[PDB]
Amino acid sequence: DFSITQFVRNLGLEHLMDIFEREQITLDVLVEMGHKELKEIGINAYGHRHKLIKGVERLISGQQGLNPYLTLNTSGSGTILIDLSPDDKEFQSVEEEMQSTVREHRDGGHAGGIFNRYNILKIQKVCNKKLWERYTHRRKEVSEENHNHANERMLFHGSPFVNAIIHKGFDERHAYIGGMFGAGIYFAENSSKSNQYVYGIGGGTGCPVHKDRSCYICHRQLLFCRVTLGKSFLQFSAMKMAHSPPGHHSVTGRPSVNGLALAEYVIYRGEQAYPEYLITYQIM
Amino acid sequence: DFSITQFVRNLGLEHLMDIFEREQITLDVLVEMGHKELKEIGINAYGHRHKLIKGVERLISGQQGLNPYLTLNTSGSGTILIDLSPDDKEFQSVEEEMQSTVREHRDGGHAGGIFNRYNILKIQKVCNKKLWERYTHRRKEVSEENHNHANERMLFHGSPFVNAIIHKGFDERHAYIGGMFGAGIYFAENSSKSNQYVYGIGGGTGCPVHKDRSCYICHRQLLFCRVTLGKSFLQFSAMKMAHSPPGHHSVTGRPSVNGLALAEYVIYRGEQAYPEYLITYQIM
Ligand SMILES: COc1cc(-c2ccccc2)ncc1C(=O)Nc1ccc2c(=O)nc(-c3ccc(C(C)(C)O)cc3)[nH]c2c1
Ligand SMILES: COc1cc(-c2ccccc2)ncc1C(=O)Nc1ccc2c(=O)nc(-c3ccc(C(C)(C)O)cc3)[nH]c2c1
Ligand SMILES: [Zn+2]
Ligand SMILES: [Zn+2]
């Protein structure tokens, strides 16, 4: 509580400290308080409130280049997870999309295992204000370049680093370097294709307890994510590219003939995706 | 013009009418004025302003069941077209989308004519507040039923009733009853596919002047529209339906297995589309 103590002492208002001590007023709280709030906590003299407000203004605006406000506004930031009720239609819709997009793969379930259906344990909504704001800023920028259309989609993503993504967001500096379409971030319409990557490329070595890629006990996690494609380049063959083709904001391809197989997408900028839903499940 | 006069006379404030005559205050304008605005025009006495504001409150809220506000606020409604400059990148994006999706058709250009690309004369943004609000309300409804995803796309629409659509909106009561997917409103990713319907089903009789379906002279108009798909049912054969399949919000399919052909979509509720862009063009 020393920062507010110094601030109040510099104004000659140390005699008010008692109030600030009882009301748990820290400097970050104080810089958001006007005449009304200050009157609520017992600062009755107009001169004291005037001095406090003027000092806050001289700090936040007078030294804007030092960014004192950002230093004081780190509280409350971070991710929270909100559990969906299985009886609500949001949970049911997410589950229906998860289940209805399973299919057989070219390999006999070597990477993701053998299964026809999932057992969904829980689905969570990922809430992070800074990452959401970054995503929306990028979405606006892309829409302005694509005749007012973001071309937004919902796609699955499987990664052994789901926790890092949900806490720090998608990052093209951790792209899939060895991917068929180059160093980007990959998403799939089929949930099974993303499930093939839950433990790593080619399924890695399986679940950490069993070293089994087809384990039916160990809990898996997928992300159902908001992805901005904008103008998407249609790619028919493997091509290693570091960034999007000129004039485009993503790449879309299909590694299998027409049928039960759905499309797949690559974005080369981390701010074009947001991990909206975290799904915990088992394969049956 | 007499509504304001009766309203003011009923309050015993007819001596103010001269002011209201010089400032061109009508009842629709008056119902939106508070103490500040009335002070600006010269109603200095507090009592007069109080009486006027209470009269407006008694009319608007007191008789809400009669909806006088709707009667008064009809002015300003309607559609306006904002022309896009060819130098702007929005115009370039729309024209690129128009030009890049031309392709050959099963018929030798019988319905739409023989051409490789268009000559774009102008592109206009359609602005209508009521239709936009209807579309956004429906989009919210669909998003709440599809895990917070509207699945919104931008698709071409051709019709000989473009003016009716832009001034009244899309209407399933004017659906394409004979369409292969039933009585619905049809959109195409290929611009040339929608170009076949600008003069009617199968091209109709052609241009109104020369009655030529391959006319290179008469100006044609297309719509590039925001379409909410929600959970879309993938249809593989021709099946006539009146509404969406249960649990879905639209239908997607394509009659041609060729890779060049893009997808086509059908909606069965007019509020799920909005005609954002009107394109005037010729075939070359
Ligand atoms: C556009 O995608 C493809 C196209 C073609 C193609 C080839 C020829 C012609 C036409 C098309 N072939 C393969 C893919 C493909 O690999 N798709 C996916 C789909 C989902 C995920 C996924 O959920 N996760 C990771 C992931 C995530 C993290 C990591 C790290 C780097 C963390 O290990 C690696 C891969 N990759 C995917 C990759
Ligand atoms: C999903 O769409 C199809 C699917 C299949 C199919 C068949 C078998 C298997 C799988 C798929 N075959 C044909 C169509 C089709 O007709 N698509 C379109 C595409 C654009 C427009 C368009 O821009 N305009 C009008 C229009 C508009 C208005 C009117 C009026 C007002 C005259 O009624 C008539 C037609 N119809 C379209 C129709
Ligand atoms: Zn295991
Ligand atoms: Zn003509």
Concatenate the DSSP letters of all residues of A188-230 into one string: ESSHHHHHTTTTSGGGTT--TTT--TT-SSS-EEEEEEEEE-S
- Closest ligand 1 atom number to CA of residue A160: 32
CA dist A190 and A263 (Å) reads 8
- CA A28, A30, A36, A38 torsion-angle sign: positive
For A146, the closest of B93, B145, B277 (CB atoms) is B93
Annotated binding-site positions of B for Zn(2+): 207, 210, 215, 218
Sequence-distant (≥ 6) Cβ neighbours of residue A61 within 8 angstroms: none
Is A191 a pocket residue for ligand 1 (Cβ < 6 Å)? Answer: no
Q: Are B148 and A90 within 8 A, CB to CB?
A: yes
For the beta sheet containing A220-228, the strands, ordered from the edge strand earlier in sequence to the opposite edge, are A80-83, A118-127, A273-283, A220-228, A152-157, A185-188, A264-267, A250-253, A232-235
Pairwise CB contact (< 8 Å): B147 & A258: no
Contacts of A149 in chain B (CB under 8 A): 152-154, 226
Contact between chains at A149 and B145 (C-beta distance less than 8 A): no
A95 touching B (Cβ < 8 Å): no
Cα–Cα–Cα angle for B265, B123, B77, rounded to 5 degrees = 85
Resolution (A): 2.4
> Method of determination?
cryo-EM
Counting DSSP H helices and E strands in chain A, the numbers are 10, 9
Q: Which of A181, A186, A187 is nearest to A238 (CA)?
A: A181
Residues 6+ apart with CB under 8 A from A120: A95, A98, A279, A280, A281
Q: Report the alpha-carbon distance of residue A238 to residue A261 in Å, rounded.
A: 17
Identify residue A249 by its one-letter amino acid code. H
CA B118 to centroid of ligand 4, rounded, Å: 15
Chain B interface, best mutation among A124, A126, A147, by max B CB count within 10 A: A147
Closest to B157 in 3D by CA, of B134, B130, B126: B126
Instruction: For residue B29, give the H/E element and its range.
Output: helix B27-30
Taking Cα atoms as reference points, which of B164, B167, B16, B159 lies closest to residue B80? B167
DSSP assigned state of A46: H
Distance separating alpha carbons of residues B101 and B117, to the nearest angstrom: 9
Q: Which of A200, A213, A223 is nearest to A283 (CA)?
A: A213
Show the domains of chain A with their CATH numbers: 2-72 (1.10.150.50), 80-283 (3.90.228.10)
Tokens describing residue A146: 């694509």
CB A68 within 8 A of CB A60: yes
Q: Which of A148, A154, A258 minimises the CB distance to B147? A: A154
Within a 13 Å sphere around the CA of A77, how many CA atoms are in the beta-carbon half? 12
- Distance CA(B118)–CA(A273), nearest Å, equals 35
